[PDB]
Amino acid sequence: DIVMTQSQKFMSTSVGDRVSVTCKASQNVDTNVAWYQKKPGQSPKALIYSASYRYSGVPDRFTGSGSGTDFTLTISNVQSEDLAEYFCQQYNSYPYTFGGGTKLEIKRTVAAPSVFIFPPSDEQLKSGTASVVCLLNNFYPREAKVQWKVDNALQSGNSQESVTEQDSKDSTYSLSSTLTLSKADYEKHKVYACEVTHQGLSSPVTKSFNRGE
């Protein structure tokens, strides 16, 4: 039973520098290992063959070698916005085994988010539920903090956040904080806000809106 490894769970590089990904195994084969890229939410892509080339690939922005119990893949970010995960296969013989793969964390400058708040749809009131969403369009880095306030009253646990993948062009991030309670709890108050303490922000910016205009 042939095995393999990436020996790296996650990887983070700068915008332009090169990065060398390793892939090891327990046997020995040459001019047979291929690689793939699982684009974020998109199918895997034929990244290489035999550690040689690949259709419609980069000119040579990525390149790697290594046979036997060792291998690598270096990628020079010459025109590289690409952010995805990459995998090695033992296509030399059955079970054509694969590997652990490693994620790619493009570093970039700190970016502040643009903030917009949205009230529950008037349609959602017909169910007694009220889902209030605080939105963060484009920002960097990942680590941050959100706080909910309703007429000065803090909120805990009653909120959930959804974190997207990384955008192809700008490396900015996007999160959706979802506050939800019964329309009873909802209609009982007038002023609703989300406080936002971002690592790329001086003071927590608190955006709000009043019900009924």
């Binding site: 039973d1 699982k38 199918s43 895997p44 892509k45 034929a46 063959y49 259709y55 419609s56 995960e85 995998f87 296969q89 059955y94 079970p95 054509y96 085994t97 694969f98 793969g101 643009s114 903030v115 917009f116 708040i117 949205f118 009230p119 529950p120 749809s121 349609e123 959602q124 889902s131 969403v133 939105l135 369009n137 959930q160 956040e161 959804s162 974190v163 997207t164 993948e165 955008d167 996007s174 959706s176 979802t178 955006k207 709000s208 809106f209």
Partner: protein, 220 residues
């Protein structure tokens, strides 16, 4: 050109039989070697097997023998993937690809077919819009979207203006609720000047529950 399209996602009960399909489209040739591949949402892929239109001696893979069996079709050259005795470990995203390295120099991957092996029933989601407020404008430019709540099968495809919009799009991953259900939001940034009756729609589609609603968004 080539398409290699597969059927939509499915949901069955633990202890069922399933036979998947992946069409040929442009690969009517017999020299292609299509393989079967699983991808659990925990970022884990595997080689299920392969098949040769001419004598496909491959049909299994160690640690998997007995759980699946591939077969082919002669009418439209569609490889069938039979899967029985299904458990929750079988829950993964599956693919098909045609790459004849000694004849061709390119390949293509199928759209993907998602499987859900759970005891719950299908459930169409709830689509509540997100109207752009006066505070949703930041520098003469606003933003809008919509929310999809409460869909049991994970595959939900949010289109916008019928597959015509892509700028500034941010579709969020399926976060689970305490209700045991998924919810996500599909947002997009737009100019505040588009308030003059520039109409946008969340052309969401839920193939499992046959739930297809294209909900428009309007301020207030």
């Amino acid at each position: 050109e080539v398409q290699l399209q597969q059927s939509g996602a499915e949901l069955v009960k633990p202890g069922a039989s399933v036979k998947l399909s992946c069409t040929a489209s442009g690969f009517n040739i017999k020299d292609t070697y299509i393989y079967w591949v699983r991808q659990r949402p925990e970022q884990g892929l595997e080689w299920i097997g392969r098949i040769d239109p001419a004598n496909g001696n491959t049909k299994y893979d160690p640690k998997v023998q007995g759980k699946a069996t591939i077969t082919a079709d002669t009418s439209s050259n569609t490889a069938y993937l039979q899967l029985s005795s299904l458990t929750f470990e079988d829950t993964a995203v599956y693919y098909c690809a045609l790459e004849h390295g000694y004849y061709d120099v390119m390949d293509y991957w199928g759209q993907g077919t998602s499987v859900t092996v759970s005891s719950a029933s299908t459930k169409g989601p709830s689509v509540f819009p997100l109207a752009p407020s006066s505070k949703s404008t930041s520098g003469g430019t606003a933003a809008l979207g919509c929310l999809v709540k409460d869909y049991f099968p994970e595959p939900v495809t949010v289109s916008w203006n019928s597959g015509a919009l892509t700028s500034g799009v941010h579709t969020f991953p399926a976060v689970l609720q305490s209700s045991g259900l998924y919810s996500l939001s599909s947002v997009v940034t737009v100019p505040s000047s588009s308030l003059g009756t520039q109409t946008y729609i969340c052309n969401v589609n839920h193939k499992p529950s046959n739930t297809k609603v294209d909900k428009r968004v309007e301020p207030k």
